Structures are given as C-alpha cells and as structure tokens.
C-alpha cells in the first residue's frame, strides 16, 4: 500500500456571487485533512484526528501562510491574465504533494494549471520546470533563475512532505490504515453483476466485453463497485463467488 499527502489551491479571478476567490484543501490519501478559503480566512481541521493532535499554534501559523498564499495566487492570476491579455473570470490551480511507497521509496510532484489545462510541471530530480507555452516559459525562466526557489521546493517534496505524511499517518492510524472487506454479491439483472460495497481502501480488483463500474463513495467512509458481463481482490485478500 502506498500513502500520499497533497495540497490543492483553487483561484478564481473575478468570481461570480458565492464562489470563493481562493480555496486550499489538503488530503492524506483519500481523506480531506485541512481546508482554507478566502471567506473564512482560516485554516481549519477537516478530520477529527487532525484537530486532536495539532496544537493551536499549528493552525495559527499556517493560517498566516495561507493568507499570504491566497494573496500571491491573486497576484499570479493577474500576471497570467495580462500575459494572455484575458478578461473575465479565469481559473488557476495548484497541486503539490508526495507519496510513500511500500518499498520505502518516495515520489514528489508539483504542478500548476490555468483554466483547467497543464501549465507548469516541476521536476525535482533535474531542478527544472516543464512549461506548456510561452507564457508558462516566461514564468519558468523567472523561477529557474532563483536557485533558492528550486532547492526550497525540492526540499519540501523530498523531506518535509514525507515527514508530515508519516506524522499524519500516526495521527489517523485508526482510520487511514484500517481495512474493511467488501460485501460481495451476484445479481442476475437483465435487459452477471458482481456487486461489492462497504469496503476500505477503495483499491479493489474485480474480474471474471466485461463492463466495470466506478469505485464510488458510499457516504460512510466506505466504497462500492461492480463488474458486469467472480474474482475479487482487496488488500491482498482474494474472494471467489460462483453463479
């Protein structure tokens, strides 16, 4: 099993009524753990095990950083909209994070997107940015001309993210590392149906043109899926069900 920590940022320029101008949500694996937006202007816990293990100085410090991060996202979104010569509402998104593999190896990723398409993609193993056009190339040169920015990001991806990931995994060990077996059943619908539900983690392999169903959230922390046309693997446990 691989575990991952990542944070998003969502910036909407000139938002319609109701939509926040800035949103930042953090996840461990499939679980929201932190949240922040331009309306509350506060970093708040999104899982109970986060609020029990993080002292108030944690939320106070990263709220201050997030207030700065919100301001720069407004600034960076303005720079894009004056390089593309764009008017109206536009989107700017960010995703940084890391993964901790089963064998102990780690991966690190950071990328930005403008209006829903890949804009800038970082390579921490070469200290370079993969730009998607000339506007992104301009920003790529500004960042690559700053060694501190390159070393700073590489450090967070390889060192601090993995440290936070392990710290969060201990905080929510009861929830993130649990295993619930799927409840598998077969149905003979007509117009054959190996339906399973109530399992966690959502990584599940089902087999027998074979039609598959999405792994959807049930709403109580478990997931559900099906396979149409039975073998089911989940957390290294294989189940067989006959006709």
């Amino acid at each position, epitope marked *: 099993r691989t575990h991952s920590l990542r944070y998003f940022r969502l910036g909407v320029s000139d938002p319609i009524h109701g939509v926040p101008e800035f949103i930042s949500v953090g996840y461990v694996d499939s679980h929201p753990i932190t949240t922040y937006d331009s309306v509350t202007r506060q970093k708040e816990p999104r899982a109970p095990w986060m609020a029990e293990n993080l002292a108030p100085d944690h939320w106070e410090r990263y709220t201050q*950083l997030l207030r700065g991060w919100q301001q720069m996202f407004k600034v960076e979104l303005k720079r894009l909209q004056r390089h593309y010569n764009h008017s109206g509402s536009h989107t700017y998104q960010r995703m940084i994070g890391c993964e901790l593999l089963e064998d102990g190896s780690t991966t690190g990723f950071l990328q930005y997107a403008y209006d829903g398409q890949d804009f800038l993609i970082f390579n921490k193993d070469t200290l370079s940015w993969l730009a998607v056009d000339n506007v992104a190339h301009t920003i790529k040169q500004a960042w690559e001309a700053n060694q501190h920015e390159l070393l700073y990001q590489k450090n967070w991806l390889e060192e601090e993210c993995i440290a936070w990931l392990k710290r969060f995994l201990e905080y929510g060990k009861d929830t993130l590392q649990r295993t619930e077996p799927p409840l598998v059943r077969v149905n003979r619908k007509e117009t054959l149906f190996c339906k399973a539900h109530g399992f966690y983690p959502p990584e599940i392999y089902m087999t027998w043109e074979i039609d598959y169903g999405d792994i959807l959230p049930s709403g109580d922390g478990t997931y559900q899926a099906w396979a149409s046309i039975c073998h089911v693997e989940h957390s290294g446990v294989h189940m067989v069900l006959q006709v």
Partner: T-cell receptor
Framework: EVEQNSGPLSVPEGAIASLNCTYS??????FFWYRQYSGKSPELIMF????GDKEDGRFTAQLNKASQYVSLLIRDSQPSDSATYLC??????????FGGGTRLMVKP | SAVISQKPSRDICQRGTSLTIQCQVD?????MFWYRQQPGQSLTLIAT?????????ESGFVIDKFPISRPNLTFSTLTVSNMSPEDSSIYLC??????????????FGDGTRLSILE
C-alpha cells in the same frame, strides 16, 4: 527554538576560519549564514538545505542534520572578512530564528 | 532580489514625541518583519507584519508602543510612540517568502538609525 553561536574569534590571515552553529529544533529545514559589517545591515552570503558541504567561492557551508550543527568555512580568509557572522535557522512554519552572532577578527 | 527601501535613513528626535518609519519593497513578497538592533549587539525581532491586520509581536514589544500597519505586501510602517532615549536603536525591515520569482530568503533593508535625545 534556539540558535547558539560563539562570541569573539580571531583567525590568522590566509588561514581557514570556521564558524560553528548549533540549533535545538530537529524539524528545521533550511540554514542561512549572514554577514554584517559594523555599520551595515545583515547580508546573506549563502544557505544550505541538505547534509554535506556546499562551496561558493571561498565559502563552504557544512550541514549535519543528525548532530544538528551548521558550519561556515572561509578558506584563505583576509581582513576584508572581518565582520559579525549571523547563523539563521528556518523551521517548518518558514519562521527564521537568529543566533547571537560570532564576530570574526582576521589579523593581517 | 527584492529591493527593500527604508525611510528615513536617520532621524534625531525629542523624548515624548512619536515617529513613524516605513518600509517599501520593489516587489510583492509574502512575509515581512521588523527588527531592532543596537550597533555591535544582537538582532532582535520586534514583530511580524501581517497584511491587513495587526502585527504578531514578540515578547516585550507591545502594540501600543510599536504600532505596525501593513496595507499591502510591498508597504508597511512602524511607529515608535512616546519616544524615550531607551528606544534609540537601528530599526530594520526584513522581507522573505514567496514572490513572482519564487521563494526568496529573508533580506534586510539598510535600516533606520533612530537617536532619541533628552
């Protein structure tokens, strides 16, 4: 946390001057060296993130995160390098903690 | 990278008056700090300049003594209210963090040398 430097230091000209710095917070990530002449402001001379050595001209920054000490080596030091050298350490919250500084006197 | 301009460079002031000094940056940087330092002594952090709200002060420095206002990321003021000779020092403006050119390290302005006389 806390950053600990020494006080007054004297180094012969041409010899290597070594300023050492220790910190208490194990979770600190970046380490900075600032130089400040008497009437001027601090000036960043270099920084280091990972274990090992980092050379920039006559300067050499050494980080040992296990033993939690950061060093700055000034090879072939000259009286121009006579100043107060500040050790700064950054924590997870990107807050910077300064040491008391070590004044270096390079005798000509 | 970021150029920090402190105004005034120096000032000689009477006890019992107030002086507002300011800090202007040529670019937008997230974090901004105010320090004080005696010549030949250690660098002492006064507070952290928060944009649009009150400053986060260190131990010993209170908001009514050193009011700090930061309307935007490039500008902030520090006021020494009811000045006394004990307040004579060199007040430094620092800036660091994220910017349009990436995460910059903390840099310092040339400071304001304040000498309050009886």
């Amino acid at each position: 946390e806390v950053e600990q430097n020494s006080g007054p230091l004297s180094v012969p000209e041409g010899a290597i001057a070594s300023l050492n710095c220790t910190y208490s917070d194990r979770g600190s990530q970046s380490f900075f060296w600032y130089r400040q002449y008497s009437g001027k402001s601090p000036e960043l001379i270099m920084f280091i993130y990972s274990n090992g050595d980092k050379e920039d001209g006559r300067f050499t920054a050494q980080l040992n995160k296990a033993s939690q000490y950061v060093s700055l080596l000034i090879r072939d030091s000259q009286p121009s390098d006579s100043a107060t050298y500040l050790c700064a350490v950054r924590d997870a919250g990107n807050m910077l903690t300064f040491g008391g500084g070590t004044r270096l006197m390079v005798k000509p | 990278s970021a150029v920090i301009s402190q105004k005034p460079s120096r000032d000689i002031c009477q006890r019992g008056t107030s002086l507002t000094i300011q800090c202007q940056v040529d670019s937008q940087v997230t974090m901004m700090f105010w320090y004080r330092q005696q010549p030949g002594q250690s660098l002492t952090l006064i507070a952290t300049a928060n944009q649009g709200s009150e400053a986060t002060y260190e131990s010993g420095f209170v908001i009514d003594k050193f009011p700090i206002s930061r309307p935007n990321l490039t500008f902030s003021t520090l006021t020494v209210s009811n000045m006394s000779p004990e307040d004579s020092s060199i007040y430094l403006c620092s800036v660091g963090g994220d910017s349009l050119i990436g995460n910059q390290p903390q840099h310092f302005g040339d400071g304001t040398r304040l000498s309050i006389l009886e």
